[PDB]
Amino acid sequence: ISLVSKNQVKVNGLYLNESVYSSYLDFVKNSDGHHNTSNFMNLFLDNISFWKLFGFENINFVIDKYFTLVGKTNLGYVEFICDNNKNIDIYFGEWKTSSSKSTIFSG
């Protein structure tokens, strides 16, 4: 986290284990095609209630160019990143089954 002003608080990066990542995946799937914009992450942060961490509710978290989100599945880890036009897509992800290994390697 990073602090900017009285109301604006900069969000840098998030790391999520299995249960919080599964809740995040359910929130992603339940959205009506709103899984791309960076304003979606403000809705997920309001769903997870970081204002309970910060005490008072009137805080607008800002998402900036290099925001990241490293989830974790049962088999491996998937990390996301924001880009120059404020959109979130996968950066890297690698879940390793006992017989086969999968990567994505965005690029």
Side-chain angles (χ1 to χ4, degrees), residues 2-102:
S2 290
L3 318 178
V4 178
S5 163
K6 255 293 174 183
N7 312 130
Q8 298 182 358
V9 167
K10 168 130 184 190
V11 168
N12 264 341
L14 269 76
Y15 172 71
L16 276 73
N17 50 349
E18 285 98 325
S19 168
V20 194
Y21 186 60
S22 291
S23 69
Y24 172 62
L25 283 185
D26 293 9
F27 187 58
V28 160
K29 191 188 181 298
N30 287 345
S31 287
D32 285 328
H34 207 267
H35 47 256
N36 289 102
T37 317
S38 74
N39 299 102
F40 158 72
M41 198 58 58
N42 280 120
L43 304 184
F44 171 63
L45 288 195
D46 293 9
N47 184 84
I48 207 165
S49 278
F50 276 181
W51 66 271
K52 308 221 296 196
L53 185 149
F54 277 116
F56 57 99
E57 208 159 19
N58 205 298
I59 281 183
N60 54 3
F61 300 107
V62 294
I63 314 287
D64 187 74
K65 270 180 189 217
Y66 290 84
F67 169 74
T68 184
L69 188 139
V70 188
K72 177 162 180 62
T73 81
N74 188 22
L75 311 158
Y77 61 98
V78 184
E79 68 248 34
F80 295 80
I81 199 166
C82 195
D83 53 3
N84 275 27
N85 51 3
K86 297 168 103 71
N87 271 316
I88 300 150
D89 286 325
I90 315 181
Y91 193 84
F92 179 74
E94 189 262 329
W95 46 96
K96 187 184 305 304
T97 309
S98 161
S99 79
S100 69
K101 157 197 69 62
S102 302

